[PDB]
Design a protein around this ligand. Sequence first.
Ligand SMILES: Nc1cccc(Nc2ncnc3c2C(=O)CC=N3)c1
Length: 303
Amino acid sequence: GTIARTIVLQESIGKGRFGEVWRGKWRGEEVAVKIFSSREERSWFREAEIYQTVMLRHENILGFIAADNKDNGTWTQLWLVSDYHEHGSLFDYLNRYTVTVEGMIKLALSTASGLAHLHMEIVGTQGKPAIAHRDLKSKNILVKKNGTCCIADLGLAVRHDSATDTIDIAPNHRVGTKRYMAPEVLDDSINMKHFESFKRADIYAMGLVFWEIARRCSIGGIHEDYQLPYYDLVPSDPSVEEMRKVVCEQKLRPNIPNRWQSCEALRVMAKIMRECWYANGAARLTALRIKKTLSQLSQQEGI
Ligand SMILES: Nc1cccc(Nc2ncnc3c2C(=O)CC=N3)c1
């Protein structure tokens, strides 16, 4: 179509399970283009569908531009064009850098604001359904030039129909990254007919992302090396069974160092992590509550 024909692909930046991401140039601006082959149409259409949700746009959700198709004369490519963020993922960003207390708050608060907006239902003519991500992880969050985050990779999301309490794709199977799966997802006790259960599972994964950020907070030169949650307990690419034995059976969570109690910002962050990590989903903090807590901390710090 008219958009893909005017875009020049410059570099393949990533190869995921669904599609390949490229840095492209559109009307002289950098854009990110996710390309799927003809046989991945279901995945491409679903992601285009979630990104076109009414009232979805928010400073902390990846800016979607357009879905399109491009025929090179041999095969057709299915495109999803979005805003380009040079830092890339929060995973890449935390591996490369350490952050200040201010930097940590900015990353955590923006992640929570994006999640609170996904989770929020807006009632009306131009109403927005509540949305649950189902695959929140530091590799699915991007860092913007201003040091704030935006949630990306919404292709596995589910949308709620509030009047009937029904989910748009009626999920009957476990999806997402095994390492970040909530205890109720790992042991398959989650009620997949209960939308609030998917919001609660996202909060647990956001808790693990906050732990990743806090390790990289550098105070008086003190900080931890980058690690994925459960790095000390499971192998790389862990199985459901491996995760379940740790999270559900032994009931372990990532370690919270006592030295996070000697700094106010880290203390608040530690308290949030613990309250995201309860085995009972109903006891977890909401994304709005986390946003309110970190907004108060940001104000106190003068960011
Ligand atoms: N969900 C989705 C759809 C289309 C592109 C993307 N990815 C990106 N978007 C913007 N900037 C980026 C990226 C990367 O992957 C990596 C670096 N910078 C995700």
